[PDB]
Design a protein around this ligand. Structure first.
Ligand SMILES: O=c1ccn([C@@H]2O[C@H](COP(=O)(O)OP(=O)(O)O)[C@@H](O)[C@H]2O)c(=O)[nH]1
Ligand SMILES: O=c1ccn([C@@H]2O[C@H](COP(=O)(O)OP(=O)(O)O)[C@@H](O)[C@H]2O)c(=O)[nH]1
Lengths: 461, 456
């Protein structure tokens, strides 16, 4: 009787791709590690023309008796024309899977199922859960900063898209974020009149219908933001900080063979401690244009810093002689896909030019690597802004860069690199302190484990 | 039977030169016509009287008078070049008025004012002297200016809300894209106001003289008359060109000769000349690197005039030029002598009007890269109206993002493609250019009519 009574089940419905999947799987593992009678079923969605399928997930899970996965049938992808807004495209694709989600839940339903854990983009699934009397929990792969922005959309109408006019000078007061936020660091979606704003609006609208909001962040980083949100609107469900949630091993990717993988780390072994700058801009596989790539190459070479540069640019694009020089001196290396967590863990890495995706930020924080910000899409500009202006752990190259921005010149890049690699940088002390705080969050008795315990109690009670 | 005209060109040798060629043209056609040119020194820059006597050729019928210099306007106004210049010239009214009164006689028959000096028409009015507008630009620019009257004084063109907005301007056949309008039209810091204030006086002049020719824009002139009877007579007296080029800085021609010798060594019509005006502001480092790569990869031979520091160029670029000799870079260039050179087969130009006229005169095709003033408009018409040029960009302006090497290379190859459609129109435009200024040609007939109107 006691055993039956203790068994509980959660159904996870994460968004496609690493960046959304990694933390969600690590979360499923954290949960099961803290309740032997907690079982989880992960619905695996197939995104049109995209990797990170079963292979990746099973690799991450690496055997877990309390976690099983079920693939959802493939459905017709939405029209490409809707890509005028990635966010709206994603929302449309996910809502198209509602019928299959309902059908799959009906097939594995039992009376021990106590809830759904949904990604930000899958909140429409809340209604499906209600059909079965199953409550839903929001699992946010971003931070409390992004949550604050989404929760603020309630005070406005779905037709009032953010002004794309003078965002070069428009400070906004967003409850949750202490600093006035420059309008030019808001996500592209907020200004998108072709579905972007509508998508953000429609999703944020469902946030308050969840039984709880779980965030991949930690108390020492955003407790004041969480407190600020409550002090503003008590209608917000309970917020649980259970991070950092990271995949510290990394999983195999086709764009990186074992030989390539091994050589990168061995090359790093040969470099002086904290002398190498790592450059990586996410998992989307879309590089900067030719001119911009040339400017980065020249800036890197002119700075004299050693580097590991991950990019998918064609060889013909590089400045004449650059690649020859690079492999002649061996002062730098280029790869198509990097074993990021192993790189950030290496003693040779002294800096990280990042696109500021949240997982990449958490990883750099966990390893105490300083970041030179170069945001591009999603909420990366907001993350860059806070890293530089709020937490003071990063240096700004650009905090408002986005698709359509002008090319960043080699001279400006060279300047950022020198400041980043400066041993006497002021952010150095802050980064060291942030490393300690992120590590302590997840040890026994740390803020995140105390939080996960209470979350599990709330879920299964 | 002497008559005297007072010329007041805009500050700077660029304008002093254009005004002098015009003074020469008029005096050459009326032995009893004398011209007095008021020289105004641009805030700061020297150019005192070096180029003056340089191209003077001791013309008995032409005299130069230097007006005292005055405190230039505050640097803060530089947010709008046009408004800055306008303010400067207006502060010169007292001196202009005093100088006219000192040389006034029953023989003075009129004032010839540059575009930026048209507000001086009030000074001429005080002495009962008629004012003529002298445009160093073309009838397309005249058309745009005259159309400003259909707007308000604070209507700075929909607040740069230009992207697809098309405009119908009398005098210009094609609907004009809002993105090829001069920076001043969108400038809310005084640019639009300056243009509006000057244009507002165009119809008050006794006649409008333009550096252009009938075979090029007669239809635009006809459209204008047909659209507004208040427009005074328009006289096309160009091309007005200095076929000798600014001699000074004259120091026996060290760098000069270096340039011409290099060109003498290249195959005929194999060289692309790149030159972007006389204002001196160089494209930024990134853009300079993209032009360098584009040129090298394209395979064309080239003579590139620029003011970039040597350290900015792509690594290996400078060495390559010196070793393979396919191209070379220089600073200030003897542009007319270069365009006249048989080695030149193409010209990447900022599309300033004098550069356009000089290129048409020597039959050299242009690949357009406008930057400021009415250059985008000039570029637009060169490509879409006259077909004598190829467009790299027609809407480029300060603030535009870098034009990549790939795009430049494509432009260079099309420009140097002997089967391009521009080459045929170019030869014809060359003939029409030359024919405009010979006896019986349209511009000399116009000159006679103008002198008759002036001294009549
Ligand atoms: O070349 C790469 C690029 C990215 N990543 C990993 O992919 C995830 C990227 O997530 P993030 O939110 O930082 O950016 P996103 O790709 O979602 O825009 C992180 O775990 C990175 O460590 C990696 O391992 N190698
Ligand atoms: O390096 C140079 C650049 C320009 N010019 C001359 O300077 C004048 C430029 O006039 P334009 O209206 O074409 O451009 P602007 O300099 O007024 O913007 C023309 O006579 C060009 O031939 C020259 O001789 N050498």
């Amino acid at each position: 009787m006691s055993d039956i009574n203790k068994n509980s089940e959660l159904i996870f419905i994460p968004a496609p791709g690493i960046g959304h999947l990694a933390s969600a799987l690590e979360f499923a593992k954290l949960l099961t590690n803290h309740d032997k009678n907690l079982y989880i079923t992960v619905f695996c969605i197939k995104f049109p023309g995209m990797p990170f399928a079963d292979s990746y997930i099973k690799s991450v899970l690496a055997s877990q008796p309390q976690i099983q996965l079920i693939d959802l049938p493939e459905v017709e992808p939405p029209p490409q024309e809707l890509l005028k807004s990635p966010e709206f495209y994603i929302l449309t694709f996910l809502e198209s899977l509602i019928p299959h989600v309902k059908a799959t839940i009906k097939t594995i339903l039992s009376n021990k199922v106590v809830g759904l854990v949904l990604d930000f983009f899958c909140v429409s699934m809340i209604d499906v859960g209600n059909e079965f009397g199953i409550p839903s929990y929001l699992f946010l792969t971003s931070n409390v900063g992004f949550l604050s922005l989404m929760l603020s959309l309630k005070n406005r109408q779905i037709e009032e898209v953010f002004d794309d006019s003078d965002r070069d000078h428009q400070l906004l007061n967003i409850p949750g974020i202490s600093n006035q936020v420059p309008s030019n660091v808001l996500p592209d979606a907020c200004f998108n009149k072709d579905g972007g704003y509508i998508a953000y609006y429609k999703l944020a609208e469902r946030f308050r219908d969840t039984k709880g909001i779980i965030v991949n962040t930690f108390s020492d980083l955003e407790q004041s933001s969480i407190d600020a949100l409550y002090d503003h609107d008590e209608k917000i469900p309970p917020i649980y900080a259970v991070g950092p949630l990271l995949d510290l091993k990394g999983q195999p990717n086709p764009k990186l063979d074992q030989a390539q993988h091994d050589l990168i780390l061995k090359w790093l072994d040969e470099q002086p401690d904290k002398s190498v700058v790592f450059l990586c801009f996410g998992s989307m596989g879309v590089s900067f244009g030719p001119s911009q790539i040339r400017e980065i190459a020249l800036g890197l070479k002119h700075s004299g810093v050693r580097f590991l540069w991950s990019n998918s640019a064609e060889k013909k694009v590089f400045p004449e002689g650059f690649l020859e020089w690079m492999e002649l001196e061996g002062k730098g290396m280029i790869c198509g896909w990097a074993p990021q967590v192993e790189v950030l863990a290496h003693k040779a890495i002294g800096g990280f030019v990042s696109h500021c995706g949240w997982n990449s930020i958490l990883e750099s924080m966990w390893f105490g690597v300083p970041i030179l910000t170069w945001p591009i899409y999603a909420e990366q500009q907001l993350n860059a802004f806070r890293l530089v202006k709020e937490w003071g752990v990063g240096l700004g190259l650009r905090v408002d860069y986005r698709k359509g921005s002008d090319v960043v010149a080699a001279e400006e890049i060279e300047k950022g690199l020198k400041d980043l690699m400066d041993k006497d940088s002021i952010v150095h002390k802050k980064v060291q302190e942030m490393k300690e705080m992120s590590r302590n969050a997840v040890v026994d008795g740390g803020s995140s484990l105390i939080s996960v315990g209470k979350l599990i109690d709330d879920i299964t009670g």
